[PDB]
Amino acid sequence: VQLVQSGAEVKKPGASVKVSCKASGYTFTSYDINWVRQATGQGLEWMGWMNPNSGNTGYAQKFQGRVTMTRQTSRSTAYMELSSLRSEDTAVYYCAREDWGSAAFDSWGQGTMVTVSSA
Amino acid sequence: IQLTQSPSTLSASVNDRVTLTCRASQSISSWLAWYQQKPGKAPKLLIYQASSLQSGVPSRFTGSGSGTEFTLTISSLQPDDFATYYCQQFNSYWTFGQGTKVEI
Amino acid sequence: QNITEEFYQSTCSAVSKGYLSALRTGWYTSVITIELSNIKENKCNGTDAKVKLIKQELDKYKNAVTELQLLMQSTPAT
Amino acid sequence: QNITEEFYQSTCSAVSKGYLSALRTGWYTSVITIELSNIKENKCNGTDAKVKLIKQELDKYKNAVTELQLLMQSTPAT
Amino acid sequence: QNITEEFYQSTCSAVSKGYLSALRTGWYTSVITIELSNIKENKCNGTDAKVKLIKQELDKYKNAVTELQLLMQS
Amino acid sequence: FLGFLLGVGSAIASGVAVCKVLHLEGEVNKIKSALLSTNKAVVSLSNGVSVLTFKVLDLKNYIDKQLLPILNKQSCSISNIETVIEFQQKNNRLLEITREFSVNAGVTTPVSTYMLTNSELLSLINDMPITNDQKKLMSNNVQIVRQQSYSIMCIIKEEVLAYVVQLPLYGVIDTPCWKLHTSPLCTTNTKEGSNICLTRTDRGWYCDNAGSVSFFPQAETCKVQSNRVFCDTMNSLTLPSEVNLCNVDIFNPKYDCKIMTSKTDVSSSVITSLGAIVSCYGKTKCTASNKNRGIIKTFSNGCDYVSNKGVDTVSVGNTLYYVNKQEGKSLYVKGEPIINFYDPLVFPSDEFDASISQVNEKINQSLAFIRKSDELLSAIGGYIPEAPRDGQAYVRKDGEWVLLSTFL
Amino acid sequence: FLGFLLGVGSAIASGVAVCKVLHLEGEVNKIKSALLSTNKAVVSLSNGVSVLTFKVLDLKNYIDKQLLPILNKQSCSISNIETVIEFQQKNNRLLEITREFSVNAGVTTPVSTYMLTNSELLSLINDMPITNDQKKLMSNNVQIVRQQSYSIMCIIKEEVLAYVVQLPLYGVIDTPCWKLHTSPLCTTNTKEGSNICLTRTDRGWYCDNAGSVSFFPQAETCKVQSNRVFCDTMNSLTLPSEVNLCNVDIFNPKYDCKIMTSKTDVSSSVITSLGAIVSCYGKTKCTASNKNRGIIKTFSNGCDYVSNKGVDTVSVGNTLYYVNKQEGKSLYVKGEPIINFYDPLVFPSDEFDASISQVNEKINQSLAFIRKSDELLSAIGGYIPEAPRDGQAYVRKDGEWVLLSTFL
Amino acid sequence: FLGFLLGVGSAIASGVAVCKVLHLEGEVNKIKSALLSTNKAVVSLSNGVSVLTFKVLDLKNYIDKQLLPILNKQSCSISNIETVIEFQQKNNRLLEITREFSVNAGVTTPVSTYMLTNSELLSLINDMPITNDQKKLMSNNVQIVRQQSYSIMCIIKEEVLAYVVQLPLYGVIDTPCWKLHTSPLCTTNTKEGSNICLTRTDRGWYCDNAGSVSFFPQAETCKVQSNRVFCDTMNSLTLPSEVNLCNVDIFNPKYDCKIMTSKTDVSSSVITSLGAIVSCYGKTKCTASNKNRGIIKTFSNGCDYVSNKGVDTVSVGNTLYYVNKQEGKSLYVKGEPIINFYDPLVFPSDEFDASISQVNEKINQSLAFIRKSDELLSAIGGYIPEAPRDGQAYVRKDGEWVLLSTFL
């Protein structure tokens, strides 16, 4: 099992960003995809889930109306697009797989750091 | 729901049994999760199903408890275990917890 | 017990055997009765500690015997 | 009243006459309401003979009102 | 919440649309259990006091568990 | 037999319409304000209709009256007495209502005595805007109005829980009605595999309504009580008043009766209001027996009828039946089995539904076609072949073409 | 498939007749006086029959006892315990029976244990005037007895409440039976629109009784417990003993079987006691799988079978059927399909129900008609138009009546 | 009307299989040990599967704690209350469990609130293994999940009571689905009875799935909530996607639509989701009336449709059907009744189930045979008798073989 993320990106305040997560080593549509973030010096914070088989999405309350999760079965790649990014959103994002037979996150990618700043 | 790690920070020496407690406040089912996050990298599975050991982990780690408290226990402290450990759940959304670090 | 199933593809039909019978022919009637009384409207005056339920589940009984009395003569359905 | 039947051998059929009609061609929509209350869960910090059940059966009340509340707009079905 | 109808007079037929789907294909067999006690049949000298309920509504539990034993051959 | 013609409709349309009307945020305040200091009200609605409102329970007043004893009175104490009596019973009703609603998706087919007691129903039927006859009729049949009514969970608000309790309205009463029963009717030929069968297919109920007869093909959708019948018009077909003529005679031209044809015969029986019909065919044994004298009558091949006077038990084949004991005057009527009037050979095989005119025209066309074929084929053998076209004047000799050499 | 051949009977005629005769103003006094000193009695009736009776609850002997110490003695002060909780408990049974009879309007089925618990039931069978083996049968299947009985309210009077509880009698016991299933069978040609189907129609339960066969067509009117089967003769037909000859062979002239045909074919499946029938047709996908491994067998076009050993799920097209798991032994008797022996061009379109002999004779008639009016047209070209009636010696020449001028 | 083409299978096979596996004399002790001091464990039986256990009610601990003061030689020394509270309130649930399982004899109707509570059901939903997608689909719809789940008693042992609970598992979500309704259609010939009627039988539910379409023909067993349908594939037929063409065109060659024919004309109606369709025939009165403006339109003889916009009630004959009040947009499509394109003489009368192509083929064969017979009958009068076989060289004069003397 392997998950590959895109490289670091920099955007201006108020802009939108898109992070890709390509899966390999298993059946893409048989498991759900989750997004979690970790601010530097802070604990983990879950963002949302996106089922690839059906395309349904569930977003956390704190991020409602700002995040969009999309899927490409032919490329077996998920995308997380965050709009109206603020200064406090400077952190690293992970894409992980959840297992239906076990209630846990078994595979994690390398991680992508995104920096938001006017400079 | 609200999660709480009663230990916030703990320090000890080699070859010790350390106990970490995790508590909730609502219908938590009976499923927990204990992760280890090495600095600069991605966390890993250690305890799932709140009592079952993941394949490949040393057996010194154990997990038990039911109700409103769940305890993770390291039987013997090894030099290669000084890292951070976290607590997860699935009430309806998802929720990780403050978490503790095992400094030496 | 010995349950044996034989299939015939020629008519595409299956037959299970070995089941031991039990049937019904006729009914039997047996009247059942519950012996009861009326109720004395005279119960008591002010309450104190154990003289409220003496009428609480007593006016309900007085009602219940009534709506049983309503089912007077009309023939029930089948 | 009288209930009389006629049997015809020509079609081998039986007919019964004597009953009186009663049939439905309309509907009435009368609304019945039951009123509820806030029932603040917190109301005690100690034990008592009666208080014991009080809390159990009031928690039952809270669960009942909550579970009926969850049925927010489930479409009625015949 | 976009429900529409189309009526074909050439066949005197009506067709709706817009309804979503939710099908059933599998079954999960999760067992449920209830703890139980053997229940002693010890008799008390006298239950004429407020312990009259305890003497009566324990025979009911005994008969209930006996009845459950009866149909255990399902 | 007539299931395949009924219409369909949503039996809860009025209830859901009223419930939706209640969700216009301009009526719940009125409905909780129009019943401030009473138990009954007549409240109009925004859409332009008025309905009755009836409240049967009251909690928050007692909840507050007890909250002071529960908390204000010596904090937590067991001093409160008779509160249990006042608490168990009050909470039990709401628990039962919630359970009954949750089991069956909130639209129970019947209305349990939990949702409303008999006295409350009597109050409702007292306050109905109807005539006196309907009120009297509903007064003595409170065990039937429940079985035809519906309960619909409607709306929950900051203190108000309300649901719709539908009730039936009787538009036609006291006109005569009559029930019908049918039975198989087949030939009694000894040789097996040489029999035909026709049965009437209109069994059910009939009731007058403004000069037109209704029809309820399924007798299980009409409860009866003593002598008065209860029925619903949701499963009714409007028919001309001539159907009862098929009662007395079938060969009338103004109305066409119904009939079903087949070729399978099995002895059986049908129980009616006051007697028993037995169609005993073939090798099976049929017997009418009384309680205290054993076998009383033995049937023969064909179909026949037995009244209840002195007869209580029927045995057909290997099954024992029972008969009703209603007191009434039966009447035997003689006749001629119509089945013997038809040609066994050209009888139509089978039809799910058919009419007398249908089979009549079918046999007519079949007979005419076979006869016109027969008249043409009766002259075969008296024809000679075409003569060769080779300029030869062949004469008819030996019934064939041949060079004429006898007379020429 | 054979629900229409059944009859109809009043299930509760016996009980209602018993109630009506009990309504003769003397039997109530007789039963009140006879049971005065005991709980079990056998009382005769005015008409001349004797029935059993029972007493299940006695509120009078307690309410009269407590009537004095609620007014004559202590008016309105704490009486004692067991006069508080016990009085709460006693009225529960009466309230519940009130609710049941008010909701069901005089007839309840199955009999809930409020009306009669296990103790009284077992007492009734112990005192039942019946043989020992029937008591042994009933003592192990009490729930079936509950599910196969009726209870009708009878009368209320000055201080006596009574009703009637029917009880089935298992008169026939310990005979061999069997169950017959069926599945659609059609041709396997690849050309759409050229398929004719065929399916057996007499599925259901067969049992032996007094040298004849009871046939139950509806599988939902017969229960199965362990390895024994319960049914009801009210939903049965009587058949001769040779019906099983259809199972071994379909063309046996001794008995005529039942079939049905149509031109519509759809893949489907049926679940037997120990295996699965699969009739897979068209371009769909039909497979049999196992939980441990996956798919295990893929069928071809046509009827097949799978035994339950080594298989758990049958995936037909889109659905997913679960096979039984009862332990047994199967046997796959091979042969040749029967539909192939029929001519597609003359096959009957469709029949609701018929017999193989009727199909054979219809095919014979269809062949005979064309055989007749096909060779009649074989004489075409052997007919010459009629000569005029003018008396002219018209000679046949060039296929017409020509004035002879060749030899003349 | 397509109920017979369905397959027949078993519903509780999986629960019975699990129960049978639960009788190996060691499994129950393993479960008791593995759930020693925790709830909701995951276990593996000897069959090699992985199932989920759950403890909902505990009585051994409470009884063991509270029986010592009552069972020991304390002379049943009453102490206080909260002993009656903690016991009398507890055993009622077990009493009701025995209640339901004795009345229903094993398998019980949709899990009752007493077998499983809402908090217990939700805590089980979390416990159950499956994708995160199927949480909001069946966590907001417990009232309808309860109606799609069985419950089977399994076994009683040393100190443990365990019963298996089925739970439906959802596999396909959010595909487009549509309902299809039909109505009678007939001509309007003046002579009563002479008309001809046809109908479409494909009414029911259609749902796209995996490139095919699942068709449910029992509309009474598919539930609706808001805009979502809910019913199992057990009652489904698999059809190719092209069948949808029958909706838009009635003579497409890709697929053949299903119809039936009859010669009986009656007036009726169907209530769609957003409107009412009415087939009015004969002299019966038809009228759609608003709740405020009274009568607004009278339907002519034939088929017609009304949208619910500004419509409250519909009346045909003596009945009265209400209409739904959902907010939506309809769209009438004009056209011509296809029944006008069929010849009355050669129209098929009775057909329980046939395709339009089958009807066309039968009609073509019918008139082809008629024309063949008439052309041959057109040759009548073009044949003379046969001359005597005595060798006479007669002449065909006046259609007879008379001696050659007219021109000789």
Author numbering:
A (entry chain H): 2 to 120
B (entry chain G): 2 to 105
C (entry chain C), D (entry chain E): 26 to 103
E (entry chain A): 26 to 99
F (entry chain F), G (entry chain D), H (entry chain B): 137 to 544
Paper text:
To elucidate the neutralizing molecular mechanism of PR306007, we prepared the Fab and the stable pre-fusion glycoprotein F variant DS-Cav1 following previously established protocols. The main interacting residues are located within the helix-turn-helix motif of site II and some residues of site V from one F protomer. The PR306007 heavy chain binds to RSV-F with 298 Å2 of surface area, and the light chain buries 287 Å2, resulting in a total buried surface area of 585 Å2. The four CDRs (HCDR1, HCDR2, HCDR3 and LCDR3) predominantly contact residues on antigenic site II, and the LCDR1 and LFR-3 contacts antigenic site V. The interactions between N52, W101, and D33 of the HCDRs of PR306007 and the bulge region constituted by T267, I266, N268, and D269 of pre-F establish a relatively stable and extensive hydrogen bond network.
The F protein, as Type-I membrane fusion protein, forms a trimeric structure as an F2-F1 heterodimer on the viral envelope and exists in two conformations: a metastable pre-fusion (pre-F) conformation and a stable post-fusion conformation. Using single-particle cryo-electron microscopy (cryo-EM) and three-dimensional reconstruction techniques, we determined the structure of the RSV pre-F and PR306007 fragment antigen-binding (Fab) complex.
